[PDB]
DNA sequence: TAAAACTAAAAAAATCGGGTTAGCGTTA
DNA sequence: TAACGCTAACCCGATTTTTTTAGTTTTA
């Protein structure tokens, strides 16, 4: 009850869980080839947030002179940029809540 | 009564109270798998504001030469950025007041 | 009647007056659990403006070499940013005037009648 | 549910009831500055008294404080513009000029949010 | 016939000509107390443009080493910012052409 | 007669009069309010000022060698675009843009 | 048949070809005096792009130490800014395709 | 079954898989010559994301003094810029989900 | 004759002609005004210029070691996105975007 | 060389044209 | 004590202004 991702698109291995969730959220007939390309980019981004968040939690534990507040500031911003991009991607595929019921 | 969060998404442990509140705000049938991924990001952010606010109140108590006005300025900005992101996330899930009232 | 704020959300103690005012501005049945979380953030910000304004008035009194014009400039900007964020928060909860009274054009007459009353008096 | 027709007798009662109570008093916790009261009274009188919610009144304090604060900054600016020679701080002059425009634009947004802009009142 | 400006608002003396022109541009009954406050800010800005333009013409006459191109650049920008603000203010009072034509 | 005269206090520059006359003729004379006429002075002054800046820019572009100031050239180019975009907004505000006049 | 450009507006001599094209693209009766002023600015800009592009092609030929990558970058940006301004100007005069098709 | 890309447009060789997917997502009669040019730019961008992502994963493996956090920051931003441009391109060709579903 | 010829003064580059012909054919010939043809030259020149910048970029990306200029690489990448976005605006302005033609 | 400050375009908020309720006098 | 004749308040979908934001330039 799913589709398999395009080979050329380059879905990361740990992103598959995310891919399956996105595809199941809209009628299977309604996925075009163009949409499936776009869905790879969405899944990759949803994965990448988990990776950056891990990086950030590490840096926040360090305390004293070693603590890099500049890096902390950057990781915080990169996480918000991804989150907002993901909202745009969802809207583009019409799998945002307004379009689904 | 509620749904359980996706394992791969990475909901932080102290964010569960927030997760439960968000899911209860809209009919259970109307949550898709894509929406549940998005709801993890919302809950994590609602938690993270409480964490930053604690950090800020600490720095504001310090007075004299030790007081870092640059860090105070940054924490204040990061808190507004999160707040505005949360409004966007709510709208995307249709759990903002207009959609529920 | 009112609602009590969520424990986990972390409403600051001196923010309670603000919380009560916001909740009373819309029908109690119409508050969801998601909205109540959002209402804590609104109340905290309405409090925090009063705190920054106090900080600013202090710095503006200082004169001479000690006067920090850079800090004065920053506090002034932070106050406008908060104010604009509060307008967005209000809109999100539908407790801004448009949502609690309707389209602008549908307020025209209501107001006229009041202006009229106010003359008959004088 | 629907609001009373502005035709109704009922409507004309509320209007007369309204103008008897001339104004509302500002929330204590909000922190209206003392010299801002004149501005507060003008804003409240510009729309029907029944139509002010508790949420709106909090927001109206922020509007009044800003309308006052413009007069304060403008005084500061006129002082600096008189100074000439080496003492003249063109950097501060530039900043005061910008802060005044930012406030002005914020005030327009605040008015619209409370529905006391001309479109809603005329 | 006209209205008199609020005392506390602080209409500058040389701004009165501008004040009178703005008030005459819409029916006298239709000015509320809130509008009159707002109209002071409009009149002060229409005055202030004339003041800055005088300052600019002075600096543009100076030539050689004394010429301050940085100040010239700033005065030019300040004049455009005022002009754009005045268009917003006009719209807010409904004395822009669309509302009066 | 054909036109209106500009408000004295507004400060229409002398060489801007040709522009003023063109703008006023572009909409019915009865339809000009006192508020509009103030706004129309700012429009005319800006339409003049573009011609002045353009002259300044063409001078600097002729200079070549070490004397050539590329920083000033860059600034004059930007100032001219900002004015042009402001003029579009001003026209819209007076309803003398093409959409309103057919 | 065409109209002749206003003298005071300052249409550049080599811009006339552009002027003629723009005027012919909409009914002659429908040009007001205000529009003709605006049309001069459009024609001057359409000319000036050709001039900057020539400047850019010169700089791109130079190679070695003499090559100014900073100027190349600036000329590239100035050309895009003009192009986008021209789109706005066209729309304002209602000689864009939507209005004429 | 498909169309062949314009020679002058310059579709990169490894982009062909992407090209085929995009063309198949809309009725063949409905592709104009202008659209086909635009579709080359879309395909090239969908390819180029895979290339940048590879570059980024390399830099993220390096640790110690050699690690360039500045380059890591830049690659992360360039990937989001491409992704947002791709959404605009899709909308322009009407092969986004709203137009096809 | 199923196309139009470009205005001489507009300055269509020689290698841009293939692009010009494709754009003109994408909309009914009667519907091209003289103003549109000027605008269409700018569109064609930009569609060409992307191919030129992309070639420049691929050269710089091959260089590795100390010679590699990451600053130039960053700039070329940005210039390519700016052009792309401008082209979308130009298409819409001429009504040869898919919505108008489908 | 990073931090502050500008600036288009997209996402959002307000407005608007035209239709439908439904209250409420007022005429009988 | 009704029935009828208006209007005000609300509603749906379209379009117009405005804010927010992603992204660039500037300045110390």
Numbering used by the authors:
A (entry chain D), B (entry chain C), E (entry chain I), G (entry chain G), H (entry chain E): 24 to 124
C (entry chain B): 24 to 145
D (entry chain A): 3 to 124
F (entry chain H), I (entry chain F): 23 to 124
Question: What does the publication say?
Answer:
The most abundant group of viruses, comprising tailed bacteriophages and evolutionarily related herpesviruses, specifically recognize their genomic DNA and package it into a preformed shell (capsid). The key component ensuring specific recognition of viral DNA from the mixture of all the nucleic acids contained in the host cell, and initiating its packaging is the small terminase protein. Packaging initiation occurs when the small terminase binds to a specific sequence (pac or cos) in the genomic DNA, facilitating the cleavage of the dsDNA by large terminase and subsequent assembly of the large terminase bound DNA complex onto the portal protein vertex of the capsid for packaging to begin.
Strikingly, in the small terminase:DNA complex, density for the N-terminal residues Asp3-Val23 of one protomer and the C terminus—residues Gly125 to Asp145—of the adjacent protomer is clearly resolved in the map. The N terminus of one protomer and the C terminus of the adjacent protomer each form an α-helix that pack against each other, in a manner reminiscent to that in a classical HTH motif, to create a DNA-binding substructure. Four rings of lysine and arginine residues: Lys96, Lys100, Arg107, and Arg114 line the channel and form hydrogen bonds with phosphates of the DNA backbone. Direct hydrogen-bonding interactions of small terminase with bases of DNA are formed solely by the DNA-binding substructure. Arg128 forms bidentate hydrogen bonds with the base of G at position 21 in the center of the small terminase binding site.
